[PDB]
Amino acid sequence: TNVLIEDLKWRGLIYQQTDEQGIEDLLNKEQVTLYCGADPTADSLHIGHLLPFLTLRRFQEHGHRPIVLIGGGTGMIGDPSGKSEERVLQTEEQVDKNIEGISKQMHNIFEFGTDHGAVLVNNRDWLGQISLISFLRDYGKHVGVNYMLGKDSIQSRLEHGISYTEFTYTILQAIDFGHLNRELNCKIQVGGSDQWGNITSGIELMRRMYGQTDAYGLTIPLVTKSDGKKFGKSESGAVWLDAEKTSPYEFYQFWINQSDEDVIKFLKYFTFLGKEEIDRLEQSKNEAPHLREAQKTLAEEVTKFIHGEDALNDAIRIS
Amino acid sequence: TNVLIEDLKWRGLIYQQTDEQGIEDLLNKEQVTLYCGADPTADSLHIGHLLPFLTLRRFQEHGHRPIVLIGGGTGMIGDPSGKSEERVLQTEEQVDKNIEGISKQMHNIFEFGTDHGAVLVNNRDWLGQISLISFLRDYGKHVGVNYMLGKDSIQSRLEHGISYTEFTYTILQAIDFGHLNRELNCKIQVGGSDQWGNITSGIELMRRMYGQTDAYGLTIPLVTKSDGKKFGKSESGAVWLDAEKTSPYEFYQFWINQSDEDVIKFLKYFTFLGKEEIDRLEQSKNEAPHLREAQKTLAEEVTKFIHGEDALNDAIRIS
Numbered sequence: 204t205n206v207l208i209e210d211l212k213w214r215g216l217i218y219q220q221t222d223e224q225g226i227e228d229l230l231n232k233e234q235v236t237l238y239c240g241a242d243p244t245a246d247s248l249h250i251g252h253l254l255p256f257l258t259l260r261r262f263q264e265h266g267h268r269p270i271v272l273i274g275g276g277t278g279m280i281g282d283p284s285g286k287s288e289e290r291v292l293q294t295e296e297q298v299d300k301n302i303e304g305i306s307k308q309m310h311n312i313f314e315f316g317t318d319h320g321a322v323l324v325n326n327r328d329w330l331g332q333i334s335l336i337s338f339l340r341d342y343g344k345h346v347g348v349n350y351m352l353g354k355d356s357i358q359s360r361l362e363h364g365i366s367y368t369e370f371t372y373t374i375l376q377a378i379d380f381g382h383l384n385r386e387l388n389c390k391i392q393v394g395g396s397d398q399w400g401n402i403t404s405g406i407e408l409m410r411r412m413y414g415q416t417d418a419y420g421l422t423i424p425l426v427t428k429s430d431g432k433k434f435g436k437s438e439s440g441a442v443w444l445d446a447e448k449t450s451p452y453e454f455y456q457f458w459i460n461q462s463d464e465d466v467i468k469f470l471k472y473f474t475f476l477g478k479e480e481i482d483r484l485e486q487s488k489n490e491a492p493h494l495r496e497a498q499k500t501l502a503e504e505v506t507k508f509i510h511g512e513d514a515l516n517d518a519i520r521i522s
Numbered sequence: 523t524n525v526l527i528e529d530l531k532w533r534g535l536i537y538q539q540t541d542e543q544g545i546e547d548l549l550n551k552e553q554v555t556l557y558c559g560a561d562p563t564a565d566s567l568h569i570g571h572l573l574p575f576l577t578l579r580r581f582q583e584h585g586h587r588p589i590v591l592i593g594g595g596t597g598m599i600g601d602p603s604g605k606s607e608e609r610v611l612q613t614e615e616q617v618d619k620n621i622e623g624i625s626k627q628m629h630n631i632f633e634f635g636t637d638h639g640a641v642l643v644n645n646r647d648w649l650g651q652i653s654l655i656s657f658l659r660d661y662g663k664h665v666g667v668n669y670m671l672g673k674d675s676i677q678s679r680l681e682h683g684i685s686y687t688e689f690t691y692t693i694l695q696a697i698d699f700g701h702l703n704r705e706l707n708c709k710i711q712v713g714g715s716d717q718w719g720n721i722t723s724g725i726e727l728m729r730r731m732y733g734q735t736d737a738y739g740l741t742i743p744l745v746t747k748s749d750g751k752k753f754g755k756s757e758s759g760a761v762w763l764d765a766e767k768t769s770p771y772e773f774y775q776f777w778i779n780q781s782d783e784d785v786i787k788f789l790k791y792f793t794f795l796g797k798e799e800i801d802r803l804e805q806s807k808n809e810a811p812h813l814r815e816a817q818k819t820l821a822e823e824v825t826k827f828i829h830g831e832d833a834l835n836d837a838i839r840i841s
């Protein structure tokens with residue numbers, strides 16, 4: 204008992220939390236249904252999107268039920284979290300195709316189709332049925348302009364030009380939690396630091412709309428390189444999870460090129476090894492460095508999980 | 523041994539780190555001189571500036587030497603970290619007065635004047651002696667435009683209008699670390715999440731300029747309210763550390779009004795109590811809630827540390 208929460212802590216997968224007791228107690232006392240979402244604004248994800256999802260798997264292992272949410276509806280708008288300029292809105296077509304690429308990739312990381320395992324939902328399924336008058340009276344009435352204002356993620360765009368569309372996004376992600384909380388009994392939402400605004404926007408709606416249903420929110424750290432240069436984007440560009448964009452070999456290199464300063468942490472972040480296994484690697488790392496042992500294992504271990512062992516080999520095959 | 527680092531972990535005062543082994547080993551093996559800086563752009567600090575400084579005290583206790591850095595020179599420019607618009611530059615006079623107010627307040631949190639205790643420096647003392655040709659050849663030569671570009675903290679302002687002045691700031695904070703590393707043997711810099719860009723900008727200069735001198739950088743978390751509303755600013759405004767701006771009573775209220783969801787964490791963050799003391803308070807908190815016991819202690823405990831016990835009383839005196 205208390206094993207999962209301890210692991211997430213040892214590996215450092217936790218940054219922010221709405222209620223630390225409530226969560227610990229919940230994660231101990233029962234089986235949680237939690238969810239993380241992705242707006243389809245690319246037909247592929249890059250390594251910068253992996254940690255939060257990988258982390259839903261971790262929750263699954265201990266017997267919880269994950270929800271991968273795909274934003275058909277919200278991806279039509281644009282999430283302004285962490286932004287400076289207007290996210291130009293794309294066509295009902297570009298979304299439709301992106302959603303096709305991304306949805307594919309979630310299927311390689313989770314096992315959909317079981318009777319009670321991982322679920323994959325699309326928010327357009329419910330936001331597409333809600334109207335302007337229906338929205339303003341059923342949900343909008345329960346959101347305060349003062350709460351929304353001052354919210355961290357708004358100031359950024361507040362000083363420049365935040366449209367009503369871009370401004371109205373959180374309420375859109377606040378209804379998803381409420382819906383999902385209601386229909387699939389979703390009690391926790393995981394996301395990265397940028398989502399802290401939209402996560403809490405949701406717990407509060409639920410609270411005012413109808414007594415918060417043991418709903419909680421927690422965030423995952425920002426993958427930081429030791430030299431402060433942004434992780435994931437080299438120069439050629441982002442390291443995509445699609446072989447047609449970043450070959451498994453190019454994908455395998457990225458990893459092996461990791462610095463000793465952050466190789467072990469990357470190991471705790473992206474691989475399902477184990478304390479003594481990871482400590483095994485730590486010792487050899489800081490003792491026979493020329494062996495690049497820890498980089499080697501991370502590379503292989505994360506390339507198997509994404510491109511199958513069969514490409515992992517074709518991740519060394521060319522010379 | 524390994525006590526300090528363990529405490530900072532139990533209370534959660536750590537977010538980002540450049541080299542986690544190197545730090546642990548350093549914090550174990552010897553006595554560290556570390557520093558955190560403040561640009562004088564206000565004649566007072568508000569509770570949002572307190573955690574990082576409070577945290578230098580924590581390091582002192584275990585026998586390390588803190589450096590409170592005041593930016594007379596840099597505060598003339600403006601730090602664009604975490605910004606969207608141009609930080610208009612203020613007059614050589616406004617700086618001069620702000621520096622007078624803030625400097626006062628650092629003196630109430632640390633004990634300056636000892637022969638080998640806490641040091642208070644001013645960067646104008648050294649940046650004021652460096653010229654344009656001297657700068658470009660001695661330090662500028664060692665900074666790469668590609669490193670600087672893509673640096674997280676730049677993108678924000680990159681999409682809008684980042685001047686050369688505003689763009690050139692990090693190199694200014696990179697020389698401070700190098701200088702201080704050289705003269706007072708400074709090996710670690712603490713700052714909040716926004717400073718991760720400027721911290722690492724400094725370890726890298728040092729590295730290229732002359733083999734990194736066991737220099738490391740670590741950051742402190744972002745104080746988050748459970749409802750996602752920004753901590754420190756109510757509506758009337760920020761809760762200042764100056765009684766002439768926020769009375770000790772108004773200061774004491776702010777604290778007592780803290781929610782049960784984050785009272786214990788606030789306790790681990792802002793007070794020098796102790797594990798069993800804080801656990802004592804946790805139990806009563808989640809068992810006899812009407813007693814507001816944990817809010818009560820935090821209020822008193824943080825009001826003594828800032829306004830003296832003599833105002834702590836005058837923090838309840840009016841009715």
Ligand SMILES: CCCCOC(=O)[C@@H](NC(=O)[C@@H](N)Cc1ccc(O)cc1)[C@H]1[C@H](O)[C@](O)(CO)[C@@H](O)CN1O
Pocket residue numbers: 239240241242243244245247248249251252253255256272273274277282305326375376379380393394395396397398401
């Ligand atoms: C692959 C294309 C990327 C599309 O999605 C994202 O970029 C991030 N998500 C968002 O913006 C959210 N408003 C999406 C959302 C949609 C509806 C909801 O009901 C809840 C959340 C992801 C980030 O990419 C992330 O890094 C991992 O995917 C982490 O920040 C968690 N986020 O949810």
Ligand SMILES: CCCCOC(=O)[C@@H](NC(=O)[C@@H](N)Cc1ccc(O)cc1)[C@H]1[C@H](O)[C@](O)(CO)[C@@H](O)CN1O
Pocket residue numbers: 558559560561562563564566567568570571572574575591592593596601624645694695698699712713714715716717720
């Ligand atoms: C009281 C007026 C506030 C003035 O300072 C700040 O606001 C923050 N500091 C900065 O901007 C830095 N470029 C300052 C600096 C100056 C020269 C250096 O060589 C290194 C750093 C503080 C923040 O306020 C903070 O929240 C705590 O003070 C935390 O982010 C740590 N920071 O250094």
